[PDB]
Design a protein around this ligand. Structure first.
Ligand SMILES: Nc1ncnc2c1ncn2[C@@H]1O[C@H](COP(=O)(O)OP(=O)(O)O)[C@@H](O)[C@H]1O
Ligand SMILES: Nc1ncnc2c1ncn2[C@@H]1O[C@H](COP(=O)(O)OP(=O)(O)O)[C@@H](O)[C@H]1O
Ligand SMILES: Nc1ncnc2c1ncn2[C@@H]1O[C@H](COP(=O)(O)OP(=O)(O)O)[C@@H](O)[C@H]1O
Ligand SMILES: [Mg+2]
Ligand SMILES: [Mg+2]
Ligand SMILES: [Mg+2]
Ligand SMILES: [Mg+2]
Lengths: 523, 527, 39, 529, 309
């Protein structure tokens, strides 16, 4: 055997592009099942042994093992779109699939891909310009408008019957998450809105607590359980005698040295306890363990101690109360004492103790409590709440509104068709081809609704030809041409812009591959 | 199929048929346990353990079935069980009946959205009817007794059921306070494999699972004190690595005699406290320690007449404090006589190899202990499960200010309301309302089938007796004749039924909207 | 990637030699035969 | 993990080894993709500028042809969607004989243009109705584009000018000589009152020099030898005998019975005397060559060589009848002297050899006669097979022209004109069939696009120029071939003429195959044996 | 490089392309194609009964003549416009990539980055060092929104959540030692002989670090970068003092920051005597150090300073 390489398979030509287009079309046809309010839910089985029952476009695509590089690139771009804006995970995939399917008509007509990529970029620029021109501003001080926007954004999920409370929950969460520190920086992180999932109860018992909810219990039953206005303090160091990493040895030759050391240990413990109970606290929250002597001292001083906590939980408690974590007990000072509490009641939710810190002055971190049936319903509700919060944050970051459904797509298509008459050369056919490719979303919505596209498509095309007819969409519930100004369906502009940019980038990346090399074993 | 050849995916009709078949199977399997006239099942594990239980949750968990819908149903049943109390078999029954009624209309050519809307409307109507039909009561001793009897009648026979009802009622009345919710984790459930099951009684106190260790100790004290503590009485070493260095045998003996002086101080302090409290040979002293005790300290305590118990659980620190009224101190700083407890009878019992400790005769105890006796392990487990279910039912009836009659008159009233409400709804929701009304009447059908009477004729007679009257005509299980449910002594719950209906509606909505069971995972066949 | 093409039937079993080595081997074989048939 | 079960109804009783495709995605779309992949294979070999293809079957053979029929026959397709197209191509080749790749391309284009309609929403019924209406319109407008007819059929200066277009599409370069040879062979065998047979042309492959060394022969040839010593025969009187040249015996098993010595001594003498008498009586009628069709004997051969009688032995059960029909003689099942009306008058019967191969040439000096034989010369079997296939295609085209003397402008102007007329007629058609009509009109542009792709020019510019020329007023203007610049050229002045009935039958069969494929809903297969 | 071929000529061509990319970076395939064509042309001469030495000599002579002829076709860069020539060269170099169409902004950004990263030698010819600009990769919008950040960008997050994320006119203090507690060496053991000294030793073990932190922050520092680990006590001290602290920083990034801001990396606090002190003359002065979130992840950016750009 005398060959150059081993177990190598090289394939070039139009076959690679054909296979990539076929894989993209298959992915688009698979993901097109979940679109519009008249869609259905799926069920995935992870190799671990659980049950994944949801309707999001990213949660279903992440549980599918594939082998084609095009499918992997589609999964990657879908995950990036889901991690960027949060919403619009299926529309981008459908648009990319349609754009790659309508691109094979020119590849068979001895057309060079460079002109195709140039036309794609020129169409993307015009689409971005049109979307920025048709931008409609909106005020952020109106709560009814924000509630209507959230309801129209979450009208597709299974919370279509409970959005009357989920909208207010998301609004309160967004209002409590926004915090301004030092300078002119206004960050909106999502690591402080902890979502708890407790099985049982009805879905109407969910609310937003002004604080947090730690699943712990008191160390001793003699401590208090209901305090009016306590002084919750925080700690970091352990409350026990530990060894040293400096390799120390205590060589003793007398007889009372053991008793002296045992007494000095208790004296140091009592000194540390006295240094802790210096500004008269009430509730001590530490991250490590607490010995029995410290617990007895805190019980004698009528102090409540909680052990074994997390760093995120401690940060949330400090943000809700208004204090800071102190490592050394000798440097407690005064400003580090949290006095933002108002209620400390420990209840039992199904043979399990829970800590509740409700009623605060100005809390900046809340914990959403969800009560459902099993775990899949709770996970779906949490995902819907996270999507609603992301949509609200994207709307607050950019006060722009565009008509959703299919009015904006038809308006952009008409604007591109009215401007394509001035172009000439080989950059006119792909422009007009991708100008009509944006109608894949309304066609799919009509097919999923009443399944009568051959009439509604031309009815919407003949209507958008007029002047003041750019906000006419298709109702997914009934199936008639209605105005978007009276229906109340709106969507942000940043999400649509990100979707269009991701679709164009994916089409450009996939329209420049004509070789597959596999069999080098990496190293 | 084109991207993953080793992946099994089903369409909509196939998945719907599979789900309907699984629901029908789970309904036909768990159908002989409804009512007290049901049958008993025997479960044998892989190790050869016989379990004789009658609960629906345990029977569904120990049935060896691998299916996603079955797993979801088991999870929902476990959630209902550990949230409310009793309501596992009826949940699966109503879920299966609703799924069958939905598939009956879907196969003819309908849409699941209209069926879901009709089911939601019927659930709202049933909730309104249950909220407008519930009667308020004061919940006296007879009401709780009747509720516990009705809850425990579907577990054992008659004598054991009444005994367990009386024991649960007495324990609840003993752990009852003037305000605040009823806190659990107070009634200790101890099982003993001796005598029979008819000797089940409630002990006003605490029963430990271990006794004394020193043979030269007192076994029965007529009057002693209770000392609850968790200090260490063993040879504890320092945190830092130390070392002893002597010269001759005298220095070694002196170091040996001096190294055991830390526990000697505590022993002397305890002896002085006991001598100050008692004094003469008339009272006793019991020391309850959570950690181990050295043999030297045990001998020193036995030399004076002290019965100490080592290695105890953490939950016993609160029960003893609530029963006797002592103080669970950790250190020997302010050793005051007021931090002790009062006892009445401290005697142990030997059962072959194990040892017990009974603390009876208390002043005002707040945490009693239920004594369970059984000749076998499966009988003990069944009695414990029945006691837990009865306690949960009593707690649910006490926490609520209303009572719902049992039997099946509530289901008949809900079906009548749904039948009278469908013409008032527009659209195609009338079929969904009719299906929901027909699915709610499955409780009397199973209750009458397991007894030994007819089903259609019994339902017709019940409907005829309920339409012409205005009372809650229940279903009898003795002669089959229609009788009153809220007059004999059959009761149930309101929040439990509400949660059951909510879970059934949620399961129906989740099943009627899922029509694709794709499985695209890793087979993990490498190597 | 230069993929090898099949020319002669069963090429992975036969062996081909140049010419000078074959002539040298033939001369050596003839010399050995003459030395054996010499006594 | 968790495993899902099967559907309790039909999937459980489906039995392993079989398949089921009830959905439109896993059936109609799969068949459309298979047909597209099949059409994308034999697409570069359509026009005269297309290359050949070397296909090897499982019999370890060699087939380097260019027609799509041979490629589809030597492919062994395991797909019904492509099997239907293969059967349609075989039927078209059996009917006409010059319209397989065109039918395949038309069916592929129709399926590709109907897939998008089915995807956007057009159902199968409306698409089928629109396709049928467009096919009827094309069949009605087709007889309106003739403007060309054949005058005489026996003129050598006219037949070779018609089949040259069909020969050039199969053999580019050397076509004038082949056309002249085919015209001469058709003229030498042309009878009267029509009735042209396809079995009157015999092809002979002889490995010789080049292609220009080939010629025609007015008669028949056989690759055998002479049993006797007689070779050069002037006035040959052929006497064909279907019975073997030997002594006739009894059908029933019977032996000879001899007792005395006189019979044992006179049996062989009488047998030889009777054989000599029969040989003398056979040669007394004037026969110069005896062509038998069975086993010969030694004594009979010696007696024939003694009286100078040429013996030709051959067994094929078809060549004997062909020679009898050529020389005008009848077969005799017995060894009896023939009559004057049962004699085979020839011209020159000799034994020569060409290309190191002994052959018996039966050349006749008559201009008419019966059948002829075309001798092929070459150095490769594939080239000889290609030349034979081209000769057969030319003979089929001549037969079609004799059956129907109507001509249509070839190249690509007829398809463009038909598409333009269909688009103009479908503009005034209300309803939902206008989309199907416009899609059927777009399928006619696949021929000029394929021609431009095979030539090496821009297809879009060629199509635009052809449409502009057709809209200006010219109708018989196709696409130029001998020009690297994408331009236009007249088809009537050049001489690019093809048959009309053949194209009509091809379009009809293509539409039939298209509607048959579209009528297929679900697919139910079993397990291979 | 990622081909793995077991042929000697293939490995030779691969190492030649690698050397060409390491010495220059552009034109890695053209040289290989030219070498393959030269080998194919020389094979025909070898097959024509020609000695390889004469062919090699002729190839060397032709290469020398071509090299001597290239100097005849040269164009002075200073005689043209400069900026336009650089833009055209960048667009030509980026013409065979994925950003060939959008080459009007990327070329200008590259030219601006090259003009900003300009180092002077020993009073002679100006130098243009590369591989110093931090090219970060983060998924988000399109490629046209990738602007140029005038300054530095670190790929690390803040230590404690209680530290501010926006400090105006801060002081960059580069350190090359871990901020942890004191620990003795292997040859220095602790033998406690009196019980009245173990507590004092345990207290001093933290008091030394506390005094070191107080002496470090005595000059009024706000930005402190530590390449090693930072304990919880140091984090609490930095939070109480009101200053940022970044742990686990690369050495090259710290060197680039110290060179841009003019600071000096101090591996220890010792001086010319026997006392650990800290001066204020070796503190890098920055401007606005704001932490921005780039798609579910944050990163600290440093703007322009006062030493270099
Ligand atoms: N009630 C409605 N009315 C009009 N348009 C809707 C409605 N619900 C959803 N849509 C449209 O359907 C599209 C898909 O939305 P959805 O399926 O919720 O998420 P994704 O955009 O990720 O697919 C959106 O672009 C939206 O404009
Ligand atoms: N003594 C009784 N008289 C009338 N009905 C009864 C009696 N005991 C049980 N039932 C009925 O049997 C049904 C099943 O009860 P059970 O199996 O104990 O719990 P679950 O209701 O959770 O299945 C109840 O709905 C109740 O109405
Ligand atoms: N000289 C020519 N110039 C242009 N086109 C030609 C010429 N000769 C043949 N053709 C084209 O070739 C096609 C037929 O080619 P061929 O594959 O040999 O037969 P078939 O009709 O069976 O496909 C005709 O449609 C005709 O347009
Ligand atoms: Mg959405
Ligand atoms: Mg029960
Ligand atoms: Mg032909
Ligand atoms: Mg380059």
């Amino acid at each position: 055997v005398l060959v150059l390489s081993q177990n190598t398979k090289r394939e070039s030509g139009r076959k690679v592009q054909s296979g990539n287009i076929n894989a993209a079309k298959t992915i688009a046809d698979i993901i097109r099942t979940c679109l519009g309010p008249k869609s259905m839910m799926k069920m995935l089985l992870d190799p671990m042994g659980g049950i994944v029952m949801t309707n999001d476009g990213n949660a279903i695509l992440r549980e599918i093992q594939v082998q084609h590089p095009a499918a992997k690139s589609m999964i990657e771009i879908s995950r990036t779109q889901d991690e960027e804006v949060g919403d619009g995970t299926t529309s981008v995939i459908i648009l990319a699939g349609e754009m790659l399917s309508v691109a094979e008509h020119f590849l068979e007509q001895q057309m060079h891909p460079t002109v195709v990529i140039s036309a794609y970029r020129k169409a993307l620029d015009d689409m971005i310009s049109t979307l920025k021109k048709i931008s409609i501003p909106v005020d952020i001080s109106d709560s009814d408008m924000m509630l209507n926007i959230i309801n129209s954004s979450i009208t597709t999920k299974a919370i279509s019957r409970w959005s009357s409370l989920a909208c207010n929950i998301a609004l309160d969460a967004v209002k409590m998450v926004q915090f301004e520190e030092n300078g002119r920086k206004e960050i909106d992180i999502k690591k402080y809105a902890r979502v708890e999932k407790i099985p049982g109860g009805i879905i109407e018992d969910s609310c937003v607590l002004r604080g947090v909810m730690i699943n712990k219990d008191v160390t001793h039953p003699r401590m208090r359980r209901y305090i009016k206005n306590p002084r919750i303090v925080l700690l970091d160091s352990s409350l026990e005698y530990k060894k040293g990493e400096s390799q120390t040895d205590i060589e003793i030759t007398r007889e009372e040295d053991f008793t002296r050391i045992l007494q000095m240990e208790e004296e140091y413990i009592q000194q540390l306890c006295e240094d802790i109970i210096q500004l008269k606290p009430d509730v001590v929250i530490t991250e490590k363990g607490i010995s029995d002597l410290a617990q007895h001292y805190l019980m004698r001083a009528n102090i409540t101690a909680i052990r074994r906590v997390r760093k995120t939980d401690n940060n949330r408690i400090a943000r809700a109360c208004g204090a800071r974590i102190v490592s050394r007990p000798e440097e407690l000072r005064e400003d580090d004492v949290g006095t933002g509490a108002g209620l400390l009641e420990i209840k039992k939710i199904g043979d399990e103790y829970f800590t509740f810190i409700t009623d605060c002055k100005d809390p900046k971190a809340c914990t959403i409590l969800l009560r459902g049936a099993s775990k899949e319903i709770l996970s779906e509700v949490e995902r819907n709440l996270q999507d609603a919060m992301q949509v609200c944050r994207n709307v607050l970051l950019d006060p722009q509104l565009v008509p959703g459904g299919g009015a904006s797509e038809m308006a952009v298509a008409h604007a591109l068709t009215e401007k394509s008459k001035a172009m000439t050369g080989v950059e006119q056919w792909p422009y007009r081809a991708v100008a009509q490719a944006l109608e894949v979303i309304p066609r799919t919505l009509i097919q999923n609704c009443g399944a009568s596209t051959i009439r509604l498509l031309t009815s919407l095309r003949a209507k958008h030809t007029q002047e003041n007819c750019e906000t006419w969409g298709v109702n997914g519930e009934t199936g008639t041409l209605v105005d978007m100004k009276e229906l109340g369906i709106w969507e942000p502009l940043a999400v649509k812009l990100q979707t269009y940019k991701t679709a164009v980038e994916t089409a450009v990346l996939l329209l420049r591959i004509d070789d597959i090399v596999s069999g080098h074993k990496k190293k | 199929k084109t991207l993953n050849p080793k992946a099994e995916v089903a369409r909509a009709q196939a998945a719907l048929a599979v789900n309907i078949s699984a629901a029908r199977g789970l309904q036909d399997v768990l159908r002989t346990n409804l009512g007290p006239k049901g049958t008993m099942k025997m479960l044998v594990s892989g190790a050869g353990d016989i379990k004789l239980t009658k609960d629906g949750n345990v029977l569904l968990h120990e049935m060896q079935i691998q299916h996603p819908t079955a797993s979801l149903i088991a999870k929902v049943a476990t959630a209902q069980d550990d949230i409310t109390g009793d309501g596992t078999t009826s949940n699966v029954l109503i879920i299966g009946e609703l799924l069958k009624q939905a598939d009956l209309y879907i196969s003819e050519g309908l849409h699941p959205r209209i069926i879901t809307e009709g089911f939601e409307a019927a659930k709202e109507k049933a909730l309104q009817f249950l909220e407008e039909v519930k009667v308020s009561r004061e919940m006296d001793r007879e009401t709780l007794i009747d509720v516990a009897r009705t809850s425990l009648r579907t577990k054992v026979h008659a004598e054991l059921a009444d005994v367990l009802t009386e024991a649960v009622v007495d324990s609840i009345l003993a752990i009852k306070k003037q305000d605040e919710p009823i806190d659990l984790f107070m009634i200790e459930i101890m099982e003993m494999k001796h005598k029979s099951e008819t000797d089940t009684s409630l002990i006003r106190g605490l029963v430990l699972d271990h006794g004394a260790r020193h043979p030269d100790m007192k076994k029965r004290v007529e009057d002693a004190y209770i000392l609850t503590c968790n200090v260490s009485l063993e040879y504890e070493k320092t945190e830092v690595n130390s070392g002893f260095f002597y010269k001759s045998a005298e220095e070694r003996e002196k170091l040996v005699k001096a190294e055991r002086k830390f526990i000697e101080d505590r022993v002397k302090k305890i002896i002085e406290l006991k001598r100050k409290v008692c004094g003469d040979s008339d009272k006793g002293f019991v020391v309850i320690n959570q950690k181990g005790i050295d043999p030297f300290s045990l001998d020193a305590l036995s030399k004076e007449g002290i019965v100490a118990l080592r290695r105890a659980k953490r939950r016993n620190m609160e029960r003893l404090t609530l029963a006797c009224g002592g103080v669970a101190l950790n250190s020997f700083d302010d050793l005051s006589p007021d931090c002790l407890g009062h006892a009445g009878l401290v005697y142990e019992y030997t059962l072959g190899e194990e040892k017990f400790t009974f603390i009876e005769k208390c002043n005002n105890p707040r945490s009693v202990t239920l004594l369970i006796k059984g000749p076998n392990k499966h009988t003990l487990t069944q009695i414990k499960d029945a006691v837990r279910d009865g306690l949960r039912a009593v707690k649910n009836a006490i926490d609520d200010g209303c009572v719902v009659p049992g039997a099946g008159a509530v289901e008949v009233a809900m079906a009548e309301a749904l039948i009278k409400h469908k013409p008032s709804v527009k659209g195609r929701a009338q079929l969904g309302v009719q299906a929901f009304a027909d699915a709610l009447l499955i409780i009397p059908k199973v209750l009458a089938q397991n007894s030994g009477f007819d089903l259609q004729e019994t339902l017709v007679k019940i409907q005829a007796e309920h339409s012409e009257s205005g009372q809650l005509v229940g279903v009898d299980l003795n002669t089959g004749e229609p009788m009153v449910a809220a007059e004999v002594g059959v009761w149930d719950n309101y929040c439990v039924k509400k949660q059951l209906l909510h879970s059934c509606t949620v399961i129906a909505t989740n099943i009627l909207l899922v029509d694709e069971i794709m499985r695209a995972g890793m087979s993990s066949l490498k190597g | 990637y230069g993929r090898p093409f099949l020319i002669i039937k069963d090429q992975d079993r036969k062996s081909r030699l140049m010419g000078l080595e074959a002539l040298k081997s033939h001369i050596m074989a003839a010399k050995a035969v003459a030395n054996t048939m010499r006594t | 993990a968790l495993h899902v079960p099967k559907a309790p109804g039909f999937a459980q009783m489906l039995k392993e080894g079989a398949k089921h495709f009830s959905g439109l995605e896993e059936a109609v779309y799969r068949n459309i993709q298979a047909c597209k992949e099949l059409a994308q294979t034999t697409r570069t070999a359509y026009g005269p500028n297309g290359m050949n293809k070397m296909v090897i079957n499982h019999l370890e053979k060699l087939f380097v042809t260019n027609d799509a029929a041979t490629i589809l026959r030597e492919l062994e397709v395991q797909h019904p969607a492509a099997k239907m197209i293969v059967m349609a191509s075989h039927m078209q080749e059996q009917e006409v004989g010059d319209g397989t790749n065109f039918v395949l391309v038309f069916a592929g284009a129709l399926l590709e243009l109907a897939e998008e309609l089915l995807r956007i929403g057009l159902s199968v019924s409306e698409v089928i109705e629109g396709y049928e209406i467009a096919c009827r319109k094309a069949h009605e407008i087709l007889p309106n584009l003739v403007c060309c007819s054949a005058k005489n059929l026996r003129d050598i200066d006219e037949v070779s000018s018609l089949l040259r277009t069909s020969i050039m599409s199969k053999q580019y370069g050397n076509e004038v000589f082949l056309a002249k040879l085919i015209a001469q062979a058709c003229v030498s065998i042309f009878p009267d009152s029509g009735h042209f047979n396809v079995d009157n042309i015999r092809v002979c492959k002889i490995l010789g020099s080049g292609i220009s060394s080939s010629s025609v022969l007015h008669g028949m040839v056989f690759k055998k030898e002479t049993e006797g010593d007689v070779t050069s025969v002037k006035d040959a009187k052929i006497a064909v005998y279907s019975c073997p040249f030997d002594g006739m015996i009894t059908e029933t098993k019977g032996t000879v019975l001899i007792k005395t010595a006189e019979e044992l001594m006179n049996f062989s003498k009488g047998e030889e005397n009777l054989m000599d008498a029969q040989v003398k009586a056979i040669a007394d009628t004037g026969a110069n060559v005896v062509v038998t069709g069975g086993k010969v004997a030694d004594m009979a051969l010696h007696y024939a060589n003694k009286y100078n009688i040429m013996l030709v032995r051959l067994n094929s059960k078809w060549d004997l009848r062909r020679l009898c029909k050529t020389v005008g003689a009848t077969a005799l099942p017995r060894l009896t002297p023939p009559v004057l009306e049962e004699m085979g008058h020839c011209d020159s019967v000799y034994l020569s050899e060409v290309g190191d191969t002994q052959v018996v040439v039966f050349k006749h000096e008559k201009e008419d006669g019966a059948i002829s034989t075309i001798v092929l010369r070459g150095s490769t079997d594939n080239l000889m097979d290609d030349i034979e296939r081209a000769v057969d295609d030319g003979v089929n085209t001549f037969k079609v022209l004799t059956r129907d003397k109507r001509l249509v402008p070839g190249g690509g102007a007829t398809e463009i004109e038909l598409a333009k007329q269909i688009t103009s007629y479908g503009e005034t058609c209300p309803g939902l069939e206008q989309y199907a009509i416009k899609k059927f009109a777009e399928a006619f542009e696949a021929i000029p696009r394929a021609l431009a792709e095979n030539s090496g020019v821009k297809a879009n510019e060629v199509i635009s120029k052809l449409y502009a020329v057709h809209q200006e007023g010219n109708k018989n203007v196709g696409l130029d071939i001998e020009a690297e610049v994408p331009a236009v050229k007249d088809m009537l002045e050049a001489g690019i003429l093809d048959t009309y009935l053949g194209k009509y039958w091809a379009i009809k069969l293509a539409t039939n195959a298209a509607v048959t494929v579209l009528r297929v809903d679900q697919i139910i297969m079993a397990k291979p044996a | 490089k990622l081909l793995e071929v077991e042929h000697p000529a293939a490995k030779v061509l691969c190492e030649l392309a690698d050397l060409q990319d390491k010495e220059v970076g552009d034109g890695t395939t053209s040289v290989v194609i030219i070498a393959a064509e030269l080998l194919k042309n020389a094979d025909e001469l070898v097959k024509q009964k020609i000695h390889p030495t004469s062919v090699i000599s002729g190839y060397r002579l032709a290469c020398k003549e071509a090299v001597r002829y290239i100097n005849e076709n040269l164009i002075v860069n200073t005689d043209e416009l400069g900026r336009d020539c650089l833009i055209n060269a960048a667009k030509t170099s980026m013409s065979s990539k994925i950003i060939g169409i959008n080459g009007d902004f990327f070329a200008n950004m590259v030219v601006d980055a090259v003009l900003a990263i300009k180092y002077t030698d020993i009073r002679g010819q100006p130098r243009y060092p590369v591989n110093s600009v931090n090219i970060l990769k983060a998924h988000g919008r399109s490629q046209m929104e990738s602007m140029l950040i005038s300054g530095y960008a670190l790929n690390c997050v803040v230590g404690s959540q209680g530290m501010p994320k926006r400090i105006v006119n801060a002081k960059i203090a580069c350190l090359d030692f871990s901020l942890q507690k004191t620990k003795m060496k292997l040859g220095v053991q602790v033998v406690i002989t009196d019980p009245e000294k173990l507590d004092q030793i345990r207290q001093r073990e933290s008091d030394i670090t506390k005094e070191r932190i107080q002496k470090i922050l005595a000059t009024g520092a706000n930005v402190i970068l530590t390449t090693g680990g930072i304990d919880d006590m140091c984090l609490k001290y930095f939070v109480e003092a009101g200053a940022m602290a970044v742990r686990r920083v690369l050495k090259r990034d710290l060197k680039r920051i110290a060179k841009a801001s003019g600071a000096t990396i101090l591996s220890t606090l010792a001086n010319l005597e026997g006392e650990e002190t800290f001066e204020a003359a070796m503190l890098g002065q920055a401007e606005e150090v704001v932490q921005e979130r780039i798609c579910d992840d944050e990163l600290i950016l440093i703007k322009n300073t006062k030493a270099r750009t």
